[PDB]
Amino acid sequence: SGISLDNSYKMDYPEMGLCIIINNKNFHKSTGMTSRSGTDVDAANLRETFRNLKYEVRNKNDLTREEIVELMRDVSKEDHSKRSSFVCVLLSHGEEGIIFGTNGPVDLKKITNFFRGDRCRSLTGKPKLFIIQACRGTELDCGIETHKIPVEADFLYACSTAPGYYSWRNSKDGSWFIQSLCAMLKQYADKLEFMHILTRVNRKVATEFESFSFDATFHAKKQIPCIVSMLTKELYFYH
């Protein structure tokens, strides 16, 4: 055998892996949370985009906090031995560190903990991608004119917005982040490493979108997504 390199994740397992999409649109009246118009556009775009990357996509709609936790636990208990990776997409209201079930909040840590290197052995050493369209607080960006491994290793959080900030969703077109993410994956998944795809997503969101509102507080605002990588290798969707 000739010289070997191992700077990239093995992505030629029999299966690419699961893509779990949690699409929360309608919230229990008692929570006072608004309906997330446009989120079905995001969910459909993600389903198609990841289907074409050969992920086994599962779409779930309007899950309570209990259902989110049980789904995640159950998924983490599957045998992923034949799968290259794992993807989870969360579309909901949020605050920093939190995603909302239809009836209340869920700690993101609680969700991702199920997939720790020591808790999901069939995903140990494989990339676990969490893609999140949700607010991280209420700040608005005004813009400016121009041998063991760590249990937290091999996670990537592709967050729609910077820490502390709102995240923007268009009721007609879908969210700025998800529409940009799907576009860049479609265009570049067969050509670029995933961090570089996400960097193009950052640029697209930052340059092509700006809010329009009759409310001065919410008008003319900008957004930058936030790539959080604990990955240990380059990730290419092809092989």
Binding site: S37, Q133, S160, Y166, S167, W168, R169, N170, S171, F212
Partner: peptide, 4 residues
């Protein structure tokens, strides 16, 4: 445009 709406916020999440």
């Amino acid at each position: 445009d709406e916020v999440d």
